[PDB]
């Protein structure tokens, strides 16, 4: 009979086989395809989601600071942040003998815990966070606004309060108020927090919500300020001799823009990053008055798209029809935004290693490792989900004749060219990239290094010199003391700047040669091919010559048959899906750099790097074989240490990999035949046929076996390396 | 002070482990085959 | 009819047809007819154990025998290993025989007898006397657990302590104060949040 | 239960009737072709989807059309 | 039609399986979850006993052996009555313990004859 | 012509039987019967796996899906050229003719036939999956 769920699909729940309750569970956020389903519900639903995301990010938020501030030693770590290592949480496990227990039990703690690698105590410390009390607020403070934010979820569909579908779609309004409230109040709010809160207490003094109204941030007492002597707020700076945490050799000042790093925690100075929210915050509010909404004043932005095409008709209609396109589909929006963000994590991950704004964050070399993986990791699944969305929006919500003749239909005319040139490209790239490396790692082989081919990046060595460093030699611009560019910035930010760049025991502007050129040619290689994937995705998601009617279809369904030669994998999901391989390839290349470009940094021999990245055996062996002895070390026939854990979790990943290799070469019908046996079998069997089951079993179909594989596959490879970089890291420092 | 017992990790873990799972799997076992009127 | 708060709403299922009806399913657990009758048969046999172990609780505290919670690690004159046994070979032939009275008649009963009242004042208004005592006594053996869990002492201890100085002595004031003052103004903001949205 | 459609460029050649592994398809009487016959699918609730018919359809494009739909035992080619 | 072998059509074999309390079909359904359970922990508890993590001390290896049987057995009677309440929804003789009532009863026998069984198999090895 | 009626008095084919047979989906949801008349005795190849014997006459089998009953009359029309049909039998008894449909076979045009799920139209002048967007349910554009 009919089952109840699921209670969105009439025809899944009409299923009598297990692919009902998989196919419930992988189409339940589809809400364009449930049924009954409207625009105005649609919206609705999507707004409720929103706020329980929003709750359980901060619900997770205050998970983290209960548990520093319960099972931690941030009141310990504060003191000495240079030989004590942070503490995640405790660890309760029945399973562990007595040497895991003793193994474990390290940091402080009088228990077995976990060494913390997110970084979260350097980034609480320099915001201000001194005592375990802090912590408790924080947690109990982002706890309120979780449950406020679930309340606010469910209270949003509720009948009165149900927002129409007009209101969802004032783009001007919106805009307006995320520019000018969701990022300028906010960054002008957190320059308050600095400016009262982070500043003092870098500088030994203790500014609470008990004492934050009789504590001036500035001896003169918003004075400049209002009679424009902004000047003043820079006046005495933090010393080169200052000791974070305490009133030796502090400052007054608030806004600063020294550049550089302070001398003692090699990070950015919080005056500067005080100053720097504080412009971004009048910038952002200020763009927040650029749309009309209700005061005559502003602009649509329907007049400025419409308003935008070449006389000559090299763009045909320009941009006219985008603003309907874009306001009335979700996929489209939802794709701009994740390409944004997916750029803007990637941002993030170079500043934040290159740039360290947490104090004594360099040092921990975990730390660094694993946020600038973690957050190139994230960025590559976003860019990857952006185009997957760009694919569903042509299939679902695209509109030819709404579209005609401007960019977004011009795209799909000469669509042939770009993929033929993504081709060309990565073809380039590859063979050449895997040339030099075969013919270095021959000439290695033969014991003549002299004769490999070793090109070097003079173009990003000149944009190095161009930013001050002078060890290449170019003197121009910023490495020229007689320029005007030098001379016009030696009173404001060059001399810190430069004394940071042309340090080489910090990882700003790292000095490149062949090896980093020849894998930035790998990376380039990693960008097209996997552009080259989803934009062939997107693009012939409407159809192609094999299928000509493939919009039809949807934007994930099996094939179309073993006719017409074969279409195996023709859908745009399956384009995304190999493009997933691609993705985690690349991230995979510029990670492997990253690691062991900064592992033999912090060995302190550079060497090591350059003399053997320029052939993949070097990659091999003094990379992958070297750093993996005391990962694999972790238990033994002769006992075990603190770092069995990473290599349990090593041979986790290795065994999820290889089980996702089973649902990506084994297909459905094999299967199918096999569980049809199973079943003659146990309706053969006494004792056992008087047990039946509820739901029919059958093979996986061909879509949720790609998605299974392609799972396990990236939970294997996450998790290979997170435990390799992890164990690696941590041992060797 | 927010600070919990020292007994704390002993319920907690296996509660989260064992029992509230089996509680869920079980009601949501039970959602899935239920049959509709 | 009252209800479970000034102006609530009977969630279509709670007519009034049961005794001590008040409308307060917000989980809406009872929805199937069937599932009503057994709840409402746990109802009233939870109730029962609670008021009896809160009347034992509360007379061992006011002679001076060991406390509730300590009263089991106390040496009796037989072993734990044969009580375990004889109270689970008792209760089996015991809760079989109150299992197939309520397929039978509905209601509770001991051993053979379904309507199992003596000097027979089993009356229409004492059924929803035991159903209130013994929604009371459950609220009443959760109290005496919790104020055991925070202060220990007991329960007769823990209202004269509260005599003492009520204005100092409760539980805002004890090691689970901001929990319960955070949970008492959300439920006080409760009826309000159903009002509003109805 | 999957969708099959026909087009009105079926030439009546009957091939995709006959490779049809559950008599899904048939001919009915048509004035659009030289043939005089169309096919037409008034039994799509037996259809399995194994597009064998469009395997077997020699028109460009396809004359006929499967869509997978909503999954049965009929569907799903279930024994059991 | 089907296939048919002396495995699955000897006399003793089918006396045997007739025999067995699952196939009476005419006792009461809890009787022959008790009788089922009983069969069932007594070689359950044997092991959790010979090869659990605490084997090896002396006193308390039976003890964590006949604890954790018990555990098993609650989680099989979990099992059980799940199982009557998603199979039994609606709709020789039909046997009673295939319906709502007759597997929760299953259920609740097998409940206790496990609990006795894994009870008695531990007093078994004193 | 008429429709015919089952005859559940049929004489199956020699077979010795096989695991390949029906299961409990017979006995509580429904299963198929073919019937033929052979010419004379002949072994024939099991559609779930064997070498059965058809009698002289009539012929009556059972099988767990309409794909096994149709391949059997496949085999049958291309070989033995004969003229197979088949019902499809609940387990309450009813039995509802399957094929040959209007008594004469699919592949060739009969007179008295419907056209049913016929677009009077291309491939390429179907509509775009926006104008079928926000509908009862997932729609495909040839749908309309």
Redesign the interface.
């Known amino acids: 009979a009919t089952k109840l769920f699921p209670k969105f699909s009439q ?2 729940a ?4 297990t ?1 009902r309750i998989w196919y419930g569970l992988a189409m339940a956020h589809d809400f364009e395809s449930h049924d009954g389903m409207t625009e105005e519900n649609l919206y609705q639903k999507i707004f409720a989601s929103h706020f329980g995301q929003l709750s359980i990010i901060f619900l997770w938020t205050s998970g983290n600071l209960f548990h520093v501030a319960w099972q931690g030693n941030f009141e310990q770590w504060v003191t000495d942040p240079v030989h004590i290592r942070p503490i995640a949480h405790a660890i309760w496990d029945p399973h562990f003998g007595q040497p895991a227990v003793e193994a474990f039990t390290r940091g402080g703690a009088s228990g077995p815990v976990n060494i913390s690698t997110s970084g979260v105590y350097q980034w609480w410390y320099t915001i201000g966070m001194r005592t375990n009390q802090d912590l408790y607020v924080g947690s109990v403070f982002l706890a309120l606004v979780s449950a406020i934010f679930l309340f606010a979820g469910w209270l949003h569909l509720q009948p009165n309060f149900q927002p129409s579908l007009s209101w969802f779609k004032d783009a001007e309004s919106r805009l307006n108020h995320h520019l000018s409230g969701l990022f300028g109040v906010s960054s002008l709010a957190w320059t308050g927090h600095l400016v009262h809160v982070a500043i003092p207490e870098s500088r030994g003094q203790h500014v609470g919500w008990d004492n934050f109204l009789s504590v001036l941030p500035h001896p003169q007492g918003l004075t400049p300020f209002f009679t424009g002597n902004w000047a003043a707020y820079a006046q005495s700076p933090d010393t080169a001799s200052h000791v974070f945490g305490t009133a030796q050799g502090s400052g007054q000042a608030i806004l600063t823009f020294l550049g550089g790093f302070h001398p003692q925690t090699q990070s950015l100075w919080l005056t500067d990053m005080a100053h720097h929210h504080l412009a971004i915050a009048v910038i952002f509010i200020v763009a927040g008055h650029m749309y009309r909404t209700n005061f005559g004043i502003g602009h649509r932005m329907q007049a400025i798209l419409e308003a935008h095409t070449p006389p000559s008709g090299s763009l045909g209609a320009g941009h006219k029809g985008l603003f309907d396109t874009v306001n009335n589909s979700l996929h489209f929006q939802l794709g701009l935004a994740l390409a944004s963000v997916g750029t803007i994590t990637s941002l993030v991950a170079q500043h934040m290693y290159s740039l360290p704004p947490y104090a004594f964050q360099a040092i921990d070399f975990t730390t660094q490792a694993a946020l600038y993986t973690h957050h190139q990791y994230i960025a590559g699944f976003i860019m990857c989900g952006a185009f997957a969305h760009g694919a569903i929006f042509f299939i679902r919500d695209y509109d030819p004749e709404q579209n005609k003749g401007n960019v977004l239909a011009r795209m799909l005319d000469h669509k042939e060219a770009l993929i033929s040139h993504l081709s060309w490209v990565s073809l380039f790239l590859g063979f050449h990239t895997l040339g030099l490396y075969v013919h270095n790692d021959v000439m290695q082989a033969f014991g003549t290094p002299e004769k490999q081919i070793l090109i070097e990046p003079v173009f990003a060595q000149w944009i190095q010199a161009a930013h001050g460093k002078a060890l290449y030699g170019f003197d121009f611009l910023l490495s020229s003391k007689t320029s005007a560019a030098f001379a016009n910035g030696q009173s404001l930010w060059l001399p810190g700047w430069l004394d940071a760049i042309n340090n080489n025991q910090n990882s700003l502007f790292l000095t490149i040669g062949p090896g980093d050129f020849l894998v930035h040619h790998a990376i380039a290689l990693g960008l097209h091919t996997t552009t080259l994937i989803l934009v062939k995705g997107a693009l012939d998601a409407r159809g192609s010559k094999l299928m ?2 493939k919009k ?2 949807g934007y994930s ?2 094939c ?5 030669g074969g279409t195996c994998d023709i859908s745009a999901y399956d384009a995304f899906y190999l493009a997933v391989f691609w993705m985690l390839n690349t991230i995979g290349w510029v990670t492997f750099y990253w690691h062991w470009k900064h592992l033999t940094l912090w060995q302190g021999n550079v060497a090591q790097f350059d003399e053997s990245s320029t052939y993949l055996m070097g990659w091999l062996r003094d990379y992958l074989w070297l750093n993996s002895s005391q990962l694999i070390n972790g238990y033994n026939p002769f006992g075990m240490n603190s770092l069995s854990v990473w290599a349990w979790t090593f041979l986790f990943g290795h065994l999820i990999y290889a089980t996702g290799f089973m649902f990506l070469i084994s297909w459905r019908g094999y299967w199918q035949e096999l569980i ?1 046996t199973l ?2 079998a146990h ?1 053969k069997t006494p004792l056992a046929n008087l047990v039946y089951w509820k739901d ?1 079993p ?1 093979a996986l179909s061909i879509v949720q076996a790609r998605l299974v594989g392609l799972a396990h596959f990236s939970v294997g490879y996450i998790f290979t390396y997170a435990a390799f970089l992890i164990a690696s890291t941590s041992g060797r420092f | 002070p927010f600070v919990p017992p020292s007994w704390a990790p002993s319920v907690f873990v296996p509660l989260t482990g064992l029992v509230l799972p089996a509680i869920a799997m079980a009601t949501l076992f039970v959602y899935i085959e239920k049959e509709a009127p | 009819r009252p209800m479970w708060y000034p102006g609530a709403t009977a969630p279509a299922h709670l007519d009034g047809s049961m005794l001590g009806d008040y409308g307060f399913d917000p989980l809406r657990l009872g929805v199937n007819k069937d599932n009503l009758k057994w709840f409402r048969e746990a109802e009233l046999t939870n109730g029962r154990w609670a008021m009896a172990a809160v009347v034992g609780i509360l007379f061992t505290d006011a002679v001076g025998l060991p406390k509730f919670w300590t009263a089991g690690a106390e040496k009796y004159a037989l072993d734990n290993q044969t009580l375990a046994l004889i109270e689970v070979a008792v209760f089996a032939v015991l809760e079989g025989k109150r299992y197939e009275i309520y397929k039978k008649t509905g209601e509770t009963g001991f051993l053979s007898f379904a309507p199992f009242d003596p000097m027979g004042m089993k009356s229409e208004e004492m059924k929803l006397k035991e159903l209130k005592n013994g929604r009371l006594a459950m609220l009443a053996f959760l109290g005496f657990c919790s104020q055991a869990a925070v202060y220990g002492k007991g329960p007769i201890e823990t209202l004269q302590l509260h005599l003492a100085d009520p204005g100092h002595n409760n539980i805002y004031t004890s090691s689970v104060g901001p929990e319960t003052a955070v949970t008492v103004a959300v439920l006080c903001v409760l009826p309000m949040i159903i009002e509003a949205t109805k | 239960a999957h ?7 079926c030439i ?1 050649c ?1 091939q995709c ?2 490779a ?4 899904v ?6 004035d659009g072709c030289k043939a ?9 609730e ?1 259809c ?1 989807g ?3 018919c ?2 077997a359809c020699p028109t460009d ?2 004359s006929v ?10 569907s ?5 | 039609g089907m296939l048919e072998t002396p495995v699955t059509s000897a006399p003793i074999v089918a006396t045997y399986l007739s025999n067995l309390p699952a196939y009476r079909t005419g006792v009461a359904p809890v009787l022959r979850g008790v009788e089922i359970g009983l069969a069932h922990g007594f070689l359950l508890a044997g092991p959790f006993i010979k090869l659990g993590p605490l084997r090896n001390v002396p006193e308390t290896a039976e003890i964590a052996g006949s604890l954790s049987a018990a555990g098993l057995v609650l989680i099989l009677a979990l099992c059980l009555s799940i199982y009557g309440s998603a199979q039994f929804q609606s709709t020789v003789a039909r046997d009673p313990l295939f319906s709502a009532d007759g597997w929760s009863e299953f259920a609740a026998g097998f409940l206790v004859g496990g609990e006795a069984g894994v009870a008695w198999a531990y007093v078994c090895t004193q | 012509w008429t429709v015919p009626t089952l005859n559940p008095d049929t004489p199956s084919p020699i077979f010795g039987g096989s695991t390949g047979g029906l ?3 017979a006995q509580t ?1 429904e299963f198929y019967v073919i019937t033929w008349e052979a010419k004379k005795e002949q072994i024939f190849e099991m559609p779930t796996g064997g070498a059965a014997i058809m009698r002289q006459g009539p012929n009556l089998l059972k ?6 009953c ?2 059997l009359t ?1 085999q049958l029309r291309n070989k033995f050229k004969l003229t197979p049909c088949f019902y499809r039998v609940f387990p309450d008894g009813k039995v509802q003719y ?2 040959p ?1 209007d008594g004469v076979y ?6 008295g ?12 002048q179907n509509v775009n999956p926006i104008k079928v967007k926000f509908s009862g349910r997932m729609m ?1 554009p ?2 309309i």
């Not at chain 6, 099988?63 to 096994?68: L, N």
Request: charged letters at 30%; glycine letters at 8%; hydrophobic letters at 35%.
């Open positions: 025809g899944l009409q299923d009598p086989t692919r000509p009617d039809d279809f369904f099996p179309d048959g073993p006719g017409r049809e079943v003659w309706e029919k059958v | 969708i099959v459609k026909i087009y009105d460029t009546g009957t009737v006959r049809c592994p559950l008599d398809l048939e001919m009915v009487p048509w005089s016959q169309m096919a037409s699918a008034p039994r799509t037996d399995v194994c597009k064998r469009e395997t494009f396809l059309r499967v869509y997978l739909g909503s999954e049965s035992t009929r799903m080619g279930l024994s059991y | 299961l409990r989906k949801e099988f767990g899906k309409k794909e096994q149709l391949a496949t399957l094929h449909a699919p592949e060739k045009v009969n007179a036939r419907v056209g049913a799920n016929q677009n009077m139209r291309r491939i390429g495909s040839a749908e």
